[PDB]
């Protein structure tokens, strides 16, 4: 029984991802997030390793939720007549990265480096598990303010990772790559790297670079804040117009701007506490 195992608290938010409530597991007072998705709104369906037909979001979350990682883990799920209910980790205290950047402005490069590194490790974990998130953005990143750890959320636009072309997309357009805008075609890893360039610009400049299709495909990156030449180079490389010109995840993490990252605990003590 779902309603007997958890106490339901305030609504945390709602939107394209469903409705998410704060919660507490009665078995041990663990903080949880309780996410409701209406069956009628579910676009892509998958099958759990048992034949049970579930939202793709559940398939993807299960693939990435084994062990520790920078991904918010699925703890349990329930099927109801008209909806699915997902029980997810809820760190506390937490702020999503969109609100954090809104409140603090452009981040110091030392802090942006720590956050960006942790996001890269989380995305590498997803890809290692066969999962493409397809909606990397500051709104889908939670900050554990005490531990200095970032967590990826909202796999509702994701897909199984593959090496062939994708011709469907329901992520965030202003983070989508020019080949999607121009041709409605993209490959998974190079499209992810584009969105990471958008995210890094967002962190070091205080807002995303592009709002309109013409800016996405124009591939001119104007820097509105003082940003080091090494960081500018990494951003412009992630935002190369031709997908084959973008760096691999390995080349990003070997980039000179990425060296000497802070540990998560140091990040919390220096920048968040």
């Amino acid at each position: 029984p779902l309603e007997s195992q958890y106490q339901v608290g305030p609504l945390l938010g709602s939107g394209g991802f469903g409705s998410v409530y704060s919660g507490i597991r009665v078995s041990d007072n663990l903080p949880v997030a309780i996410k409701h998705v209406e069956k009628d709104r579910i676009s892509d369906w998958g099958e759990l390793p048992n034949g049970t037909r579930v939202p793709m979001e559940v398939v993807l979350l299960k693939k990435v939720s084994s062990g520790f990682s920078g991904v918010i883990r699925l703890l349990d799920w329930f099927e109801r007549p008209d909806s699915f209910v997902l029980i997810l980790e809820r760190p506390e205290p937490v702020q999503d990265l969109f609100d954090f950047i809104t409140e603090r402005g452009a981040l110091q490069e030392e802090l942006a480096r720590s956050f960006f590194w942790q996001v890269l490790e989380a995305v590498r974990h997803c890809h290692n598990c066969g999962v493409l998130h397809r909606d990397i953005k500051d709104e889908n990143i939670l900050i554990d303010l005490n531990r200095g750890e970032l967590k990826l959320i909202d796999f509702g636009s994701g897909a199984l990772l593959k090496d062939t072309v994708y011709t469907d997309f329901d992520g965030t357009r202003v983070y989508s790559p020019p080949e999607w805008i121009r041709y409605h075609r993209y490959h998974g890893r190079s499209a992810a790297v584009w969105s990471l360039g958008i995210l890094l610009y967002d962190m070091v400049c205080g807002d995303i670079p592009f709002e309109h299709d013409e800016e996405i495909i124009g591939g001119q990156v104007f820097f509105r804040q003082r940003v080091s030449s090494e960081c500018q180079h990494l951003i412009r490389w992630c935002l190369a117009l031709r997908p084959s010109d973008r760096p691999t995840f390995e080349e990003i993490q070997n980039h000179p701007w990425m060296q000497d990252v802070l540990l998560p605990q140091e990040t919390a003590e220096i920048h968040l506490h």
Binding site: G16, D170, T172
Partner: peptide, 9 residues
Amino acid sequence: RKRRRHPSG
């Protein structure tokens, strides 16, 4: 300058 969220759809 206006900073806003962008829905996923």
